[PDB]
Amino acid sequence: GIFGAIAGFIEGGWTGMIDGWYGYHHENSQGSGYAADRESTQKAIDGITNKVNSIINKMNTQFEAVDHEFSNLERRIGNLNKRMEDGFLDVWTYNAELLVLLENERTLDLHDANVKNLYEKVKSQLRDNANDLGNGCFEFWHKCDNECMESVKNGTYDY
Amino acid sequence: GIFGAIAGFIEGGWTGMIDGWYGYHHENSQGSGYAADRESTQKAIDGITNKVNSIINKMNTQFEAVDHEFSNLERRIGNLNKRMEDGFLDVWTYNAELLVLLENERTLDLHDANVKNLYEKVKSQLRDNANDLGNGCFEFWHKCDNECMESVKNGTYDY
Amino acid sequence: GIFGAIAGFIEGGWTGMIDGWYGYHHENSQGSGYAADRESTQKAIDGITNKVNSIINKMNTQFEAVDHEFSNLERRIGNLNKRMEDGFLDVWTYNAELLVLLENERTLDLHDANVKNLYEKVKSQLRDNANDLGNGCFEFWHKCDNECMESVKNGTYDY
Amino acid sequence: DKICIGYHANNSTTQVDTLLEKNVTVTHSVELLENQKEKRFCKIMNKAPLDLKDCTIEGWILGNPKCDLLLGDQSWSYIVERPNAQNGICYPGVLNELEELKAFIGSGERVERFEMFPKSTWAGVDTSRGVTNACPSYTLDSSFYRNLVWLVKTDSATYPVIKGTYNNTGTQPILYFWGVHHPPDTTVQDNLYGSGDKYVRMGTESMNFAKSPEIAARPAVNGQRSRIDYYWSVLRPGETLNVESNGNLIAPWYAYKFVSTNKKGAVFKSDLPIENCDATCQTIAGVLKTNKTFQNVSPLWIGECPKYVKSESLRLATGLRNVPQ
Amino acid sequence: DKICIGYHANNSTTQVDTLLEKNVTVTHSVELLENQKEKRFCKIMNKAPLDLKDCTIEGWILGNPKCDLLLGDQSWSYIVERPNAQNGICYPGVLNELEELKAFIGSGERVERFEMFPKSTWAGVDTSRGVTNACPSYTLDSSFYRNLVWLVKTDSATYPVIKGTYNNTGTQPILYFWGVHHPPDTTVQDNLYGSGDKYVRMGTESMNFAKSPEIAARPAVNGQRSRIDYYWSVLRPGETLNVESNGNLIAPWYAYKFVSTNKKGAVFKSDLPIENCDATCQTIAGVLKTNKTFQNVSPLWIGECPKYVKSESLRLATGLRNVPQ
Amino acid sequence: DKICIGYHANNSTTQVDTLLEKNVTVTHSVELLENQKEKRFCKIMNKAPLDLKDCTIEGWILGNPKCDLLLGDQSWSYIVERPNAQNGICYPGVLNELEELKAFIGSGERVERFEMFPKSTWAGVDTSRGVTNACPSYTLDSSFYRNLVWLVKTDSATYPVIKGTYNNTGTQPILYFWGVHHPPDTTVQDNLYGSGDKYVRMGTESMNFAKSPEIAARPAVNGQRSRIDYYWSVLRPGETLNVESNGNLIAPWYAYKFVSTNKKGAVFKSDLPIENCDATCQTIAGVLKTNKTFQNVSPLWIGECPKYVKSESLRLATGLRNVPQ
Ligand SMILES: *[C@@H]1O[C@H](CO)[C@@H](O)[C@H](O)[C@H]1NC(C)=O
Ligand SMILES: *[C@@H]1O[C@H](CO)[C@@H](O)[C@H](O)[C@H]1NC(C)=O
Numbered sequence A, B, C: 001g002i003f004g005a006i007a008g009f010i011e012g013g014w015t016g017m018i019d020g021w022y023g024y025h026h027e028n029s030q031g032s033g034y035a036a037d038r039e040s041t042q043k044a045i046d047g048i049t050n051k052v053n054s055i056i057n058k059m060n061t062q063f064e065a066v067d068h069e070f071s072n073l074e075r076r077i078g079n080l081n082k083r084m085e086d087g088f089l090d091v092w093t094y095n096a097e098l099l100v101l102l103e104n105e106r107t108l109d110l111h112d113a114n115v116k117n118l119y120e121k122v123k124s125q126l127r128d129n130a131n132d133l134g135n136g137c138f139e140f141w142h143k144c145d146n147e148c149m150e151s152v153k154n155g156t157y158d159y
Numbered sequence D, E, F: 001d002k003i004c005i006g007y008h009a010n011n012s013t014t015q016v017d018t019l020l021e022k023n024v025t026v027t028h029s030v031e032l033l034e035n036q037k038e039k040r041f042c043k044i045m046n047k048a049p050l051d052l053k054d055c056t057i058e059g060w061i062l063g064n065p066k067c068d069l070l071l072g073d074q075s076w077s078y079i080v081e082r083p084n085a086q087n088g089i090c091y092p093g094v095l096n097e098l099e100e101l102k103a104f105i106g107s108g109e110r111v112e113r114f115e116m117f118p119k120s121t122w123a124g125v126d127t128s129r130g131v132t133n134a135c136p137s138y139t140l141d142s143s144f145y146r147n148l149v150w151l152v153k154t155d156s157a158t159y160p161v162i163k164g165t166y167n168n169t170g171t172q173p174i175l176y177f178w179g180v181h182h183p184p185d186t187t188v189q190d191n192l193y194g195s196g197d198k199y200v201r202m203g204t205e206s207m208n209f210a211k212s213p214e215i216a217a218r219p220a221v222n223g224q225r226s227r228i229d230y231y232w233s234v235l236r237p238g239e240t241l242n243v244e245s246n247g248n249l250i251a252p253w254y255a256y257k258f259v260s261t262n263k264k265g266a267v268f269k270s271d272l273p274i275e276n277c278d279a280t281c282q283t284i285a286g287v288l289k290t291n292k293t294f295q296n297v298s299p300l301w302i303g304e305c306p307k308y309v310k311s312e313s314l315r316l317a318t319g320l321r322n323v324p325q
């Protein structure tokens, strides 16, 4: 990633986290678990749903070729029709393939950025109440129950 | 934002700053006040002016439809002309609408990035004098008079 | 840059490093010199080779103008052929010029991000052994021979 | 005790490509292009197409004797002409403005056949001997088109000026046909139409037509050295057609009331079967059933279809890069 | 003591759209598309257009008697034809290659009317009694086109071969017209032109023309069952035209020296008014006054206009996302 | 001790442009557009083009006497017709369907000239004295087209009916030409062909032709007030041609067996020289020797060329922004 997060300092992903795109793995000795940050994930979901929907509807026109036939003395206009139809076919092909390539990239960079921002949103609610291993994992000096674990992710952590 | 700054850790914007796009709000014992970063604001202005001008001039050609008429026995070439004209109308409509959407995105991300970089260039001139609220504001070490303040904006006050 | 690295807090690039796009400049006991981080640099090479190859291959079609002549009573279809050929010429010119401009930015933004990400993967294991001047440079408190110095680039610095 | 931040992964092996890197696996993605086809012809807006079988459009609309299967009224959402239709223009000659005619009929939706000029219209001529072995039915080896009548002078006297009128008082345009016979020599001309220069002339409010025989020695085609120049036109509502000729007329007999469609219209030359299906999108290559945006099946279609494109896939990444361990 | 880092906001109400989000308020933005029109026709290059009023292009250029307001020289930046101008071809018939003629005139800038063949050119025929109630002026109920003359045999002899020459020694191409008269029966033909086979033949260096009458009864149009085949051509500078006929000629009388204007030429079918204004950009729907890059008013225009596009808005963000508090 | 993170730089002065900023110097970049041309015509697929020299396509294919260097068999990768080629149609008249003929020959790759109708075919007529100062092989001499023969009645008797047949039993279609001579008056007509109604008649399986002279006085062109209507056609493999005439026939003499290419053929109007070089990409403006994706030389080309575009440069950044110290 260009934001360095996905396949970066957080070099892997969690098979365990199944109901979101971004999230957490706390472990206290009430226990363990995966839980996803549902409001950044829902923001990414909405943004990307909008992107796809935008692309689909900007692509809701069709150039229409025709069955029209041409005599032996209509070679020129026959060829004109062929070059026209092929012409538009080529530009729409180009437009579609190019767009996909570009947007795919940007979609990945978007996700990469989002992960990075979440990591950043936690590091400065928690900064010496915590240490940082640098792999994107967080180190508390205190005692962290799960209304403490819920402290952090709720965004109400009390410093 | 993807850089996390605008509508992020800096959760709002200053109407009070009427002097540019990015800037500062100091607070000292002479007073308080808003002042904008004239060199990051002017590079952004220059860059975006260039984007618009670039876009304008790349769109400075026109496909030209014609008044031409076609007899009852020229249904095919008439329809060819209609399909051609509608075709180019379609591709240019797509091109304009798509470009606008893509560039609006990128423009917003650009502003976001600009803010983030200013925050870190101030952040990395002073980091343990004063320490960051997470705000995008810093409460200082010291008493900072006011060319103690633009000191910083100077990019040159030495710690 | 949008990630702030190139022509930013790292205010210039090294003529001396003739070895790649991104890298290092050491200085210790044995001496100093340039060496480039090549697995980040030509991951960039492969990626950009990729962009160019993709662009070439999406631009790998030709609209075909024709030699055809038209009588005095074929003024309409003659002009039709003219408007069609010019029409397609315009969109391909637009698409090409626009693409270049867009991709050039994004290319610079990519390099910018690459430099920044290298800076942070160094700082994140050099925690407190080093001082980050903000220069994109690190000052050790303890000292570093050259099996130390590659242990840093190597990804192998344990402390 | 302590907490970490990360991202999703799964068993998905589906990959996408970007400008910087190809073949990148992602968690979730969507396919925008359909490449799947039902190789058949089905109904459009619940209305069946018209199969011309072993007849071409010419043979159908001229009423080739071997095309009686298609004779009479017809309604269609589109037309299917088979690549190997044997029964078209049986009597050698050229159908003038053939391609415009096809384009016009394609723009059609229904035709009602009717008698426009009874043989009684043509006075002092023989209307019963206009047959040739070039146009057999499956009942007589020598026949002629069902919509045309080949007039010959009486077996006695010469060829009088003959006249015909049809005033289109109806609300529908009428598609009709006629022809000019071109003998190979002067003596055939005289055996069939008698001496003197001959003409075929037709006039409406917005159309006038006049042609003479162009008698020349030709090679045999279907055993015939003569030719017929076939013509078509459209008598619009309100208009009236006057016909005048003193020889060589292939007179209009039956014609078609025509219902043009504002629409689309299609004529597919294809071998695919017509089944009892329904469809919202029908291409020359088959039927599409999809919600997708793009397709690479065919640029020729009727109904509402995805934008045709030459790509084999257009898969859009929605999810993240997949990095499982 | 403290310092804060932040960004601009304001009273702005303007929203834009992105790929990721719709309806985003931003501080500063620009609209690239113009949707505003002055619904009128103005001067182009400070040169006024040509209003044809109640005349069609046919009626104007043939010199329909009811188009005498338009008679003579004309200069125009473009042409405005009104949706149902009544006065075109008054004597029923077809103007050949009509659509090419319109396109050719559209490519024009100016015409100079002049007499090409005085009635004296045609010897031994009557040039004064070629008028019809199908073509009234506003003074006589029976007249004829101002640029054509309908020749008839004299109160006297039969219709002799008549000849005419015009040498275009000028530097400008000449747009001109002629015709062939087609009577409805033989007795009319002989009353007007006498008996015998008739021809109309015309020749230049690069054009030859030869046609005969096509005598047939047609439906009545404006009281005439007769027809006229109308023809036009362009006598190039240097070229010379020979006219020869022994009957049924609708002779060229007046013609136009033609100034092609190199540029885009336009003919707008519209009812909008022509006022005493100026413009650099004139569409069929009205005048555009903008510096903007796109417009959704009309694809048809003369002058320098923004790219036509179907978008309703194309607003581009320049400032940042607006978050006032 | 200490360690640094930084990036590459070099002596590079080459800049690119972006959306946000123009004139940005970078370390490494690539040019995608070719703007360099060799202003000449070279071989394509090691096969030489056909120079028509001072001949137009008409003069060549009709066999204008001044074009004898082009006579006979020809093979070409493309055709080069010169802008001020003087030798085309020498005997004044019009070649019917000229533009389709050109397009057709353009779709060709090789022709074999052969004698289709020896002069012996036409019995009881004069085949050797149909020559004119309008078609010199030089300037003062009297000749005629090499592929056509101007038949005249023999010096006394009348012009008998003459007949000619060619059965194309070969596997290649035949391009051939003929004409109808149009004298300026009746006295010339009778001196050349005698009195009586005259006809020129031609028939194949798929083509009919019959026309009479249209005698009228025209302006002199190359000293002729007469005209010839030129016609061309293609006798397909298997087809057979009957030729029959009693006067005014410009008979086919030599014709061409024609080899279609399968397409992408070209006809370049150009002044450029043909030299003994080869090429994979040949434009009307010259040869391209390149590996690049784009070019701004010409949209008109033969072979495999880069996409034509009007851009002056298309330079793509690969390296990073250049910040030397
Ligand atoms: C680090 O570089 C050293 C050079 O001394 C090499 O021996 C070692 O294998 C490298 N280790 C890794 C993990 O790359
Ligand atoms: C991507 O994967 C396919 C098979 O899954 C493989 O054939 C192809 O070569 C890969 N792409 C590249 C650029 O190697």
Ligand SMILES: *[C@@H]1O[C@H](CO)[C@@H](O)[C@H](O)[C@H]1NC(C)=O
Binding pocket: E022, E023
């Ligand atoms: C955007 O805002 C406008 C208000 O002018 C509203 O009419 C429209 O429905 C909104 N659309 C979306 C998708 O929010």
Ligand SMILES: *[C@@H]1O[C@H](CO)[C@@H](O)[C@H](O)[C@H]1NC(C)=O
Binding pocket: D167, D169, D240, E219, E220
């Ligand atoms: C056709 O019939 C209508 C009345 O049915 C009549 O008004 C009209 O004049 C007729 N047209 C001709 C050409 O007879």
Ligand SMILES: *[C@@H]1O[C@H](CO)[C@@H](O)[C@H](O)[C@H]1NC(C)=O
Binding pocket: F022, F023
């Ligand atoms: C870019 O640099 C060129 C130097 O070759 C200069 O002529 C041009 O004006 C510059 N462009 C702009 C927009 O200033």
Ligand SMILES: *[C@@H]1O[C@H](CO)[C@@H](O)[C@H](O)[C@H]1NC(C)=O
Binding pocket: D219, D220, F167, F169, F240
């Ligand atoms: C042409 O020749 C073949 C035999 O070579 C023959 O079968 C065919 O009938 C001939 N056609 C004509 C029109 O003579």
Ligand SMILES: *[C@@H]1O[C@H](CO)[C@@H](O)[C@H](O)[C@H]1NC(C)=O
Binding pocket: E167, E169, E240, F219, F220
């Ligand atoms: C036309 O006039 C010029 C002189 O102006 C003369 O040389 C030429 O011969 C004339 N052409 C004809 C056909 O009379």
